[model samples]
Target: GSVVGGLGGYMLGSAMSRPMIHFGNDWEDRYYRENMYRYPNQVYYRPVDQYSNQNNFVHDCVNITIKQHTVTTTTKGENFTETDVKMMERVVEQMCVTQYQKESQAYYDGRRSS
Candidate 1:
């Protein structure tokens, strides 16, 4: 009976689905956000159908999330106080989540079209 359970476990292992292609550090990854705004430089690494064809017919998808926090400081003579009397300090913090899926699209399109 113990041998039978071992064989059952082997069967379950064999029935598992294979994993898909995922980016890993094995190879250096290319492309960056700040530098992908120009004409030829538009978009980072794009996925292609080749990934599907070599494996099987597939639809590719890319999800991009960008976050930025900016701090602006302004100093005025009137805003300051105490020992530095009449001096002033102003601070502004801005956080934004901008969508730039176009780059991802361009990469995929460029690779597919090319």
Candidate 2:
């Protein structure tokens, strides 16, 4: 039952770790402090949860639409010949996919229960 135990432990740890962050007026400070202690160098699970919850796991989709529209509008305005939206698309895609994969792998591989 080590797998079950490990899963339980991970869930418990996640729950306990959540309350340390304070979303008050000093959110930045609280974020820094809590994140620094709980996760340094940007941990996978925390950021994934934050982004997924904040954007309902559709941030990438929304960003892509926004960028496309921005580029279209900019072209209509005769501001730019062609928008270099590729970089932004690539960066966001890589970030979101990588985060998702890492979190998924951690949860799966670390599973101790059947």
Candidate 3:
């Protein structure tokens, strides 16, 4: 069963997804979607958060998917690694999944209890 509730007029969406505050929108939810194009072929969370920049948490989690060849491409003059990158490929994948979780709210709003 999926329960999506909001404490003060928001959309929890689910136990794991972020709290969407909308009587229109709960969290900003800006990173994951925007970063994909911002860094374009790179994994970056700047120009943005500390991991606090979540939708919730501005400093929230970040994940970007790119081709294996793109992994070696340089963005902002920095080179990405694919040697052990497979491990991180899953890392981004995990955060990509985390994007759906409400964990970000713990830091941004503290609306939920642990």
In order, the Cα lDDT scores of the candidates are: 0.18, 0.36, 0.33
Q: Write model 2 residue lDDT over 1-114, tens digit each, in one string.
A: 223122212211111122232334575544345433322111112324344343443354325433443554557662312223332333334344445555556556854434
Whole-structure CA lDDT of model 1: 0.18
Worst 10 residues of 3 by lDDT: 2-11
Candidate 3 lDDT, 1-114, residue by residue in tens: 312111222222211222222112222234323223333222222222234334432222232233322443543354445422433343444444454334454445664454
- Could you say which candidate leads in lDDT? 2
Candidate 1 Cα misplacement greater than 4 A, ranges: 1-69, 73-98, 111-114
List clashing residue pairs in candidate 2: 3-112, 3-113
List the candidates' TM-scores in order.
Answer: 0.15, 0.27, 0.25
Over 1-114, each residue of candidate 1 has an lDDT whose tens digit, in order, gives 233123212111111121222224333112212222211111111222223231111111111101000011112222222311101000000000001233334455764555
Q: lDDT ranking from best to worst?
A: 2, 3, 1
Inter-residue clash pairs, candidate 1: 77-86, 79-87, 79-88, 80-87, 80-88
Error of 3 at 57 (Å): 20
Looking at candidate 2, what is the lDDT of residue 112?
48
Runs of candidate 3 with Cα error greater than 4 angstroms are 1-63, 67-73, 102-114
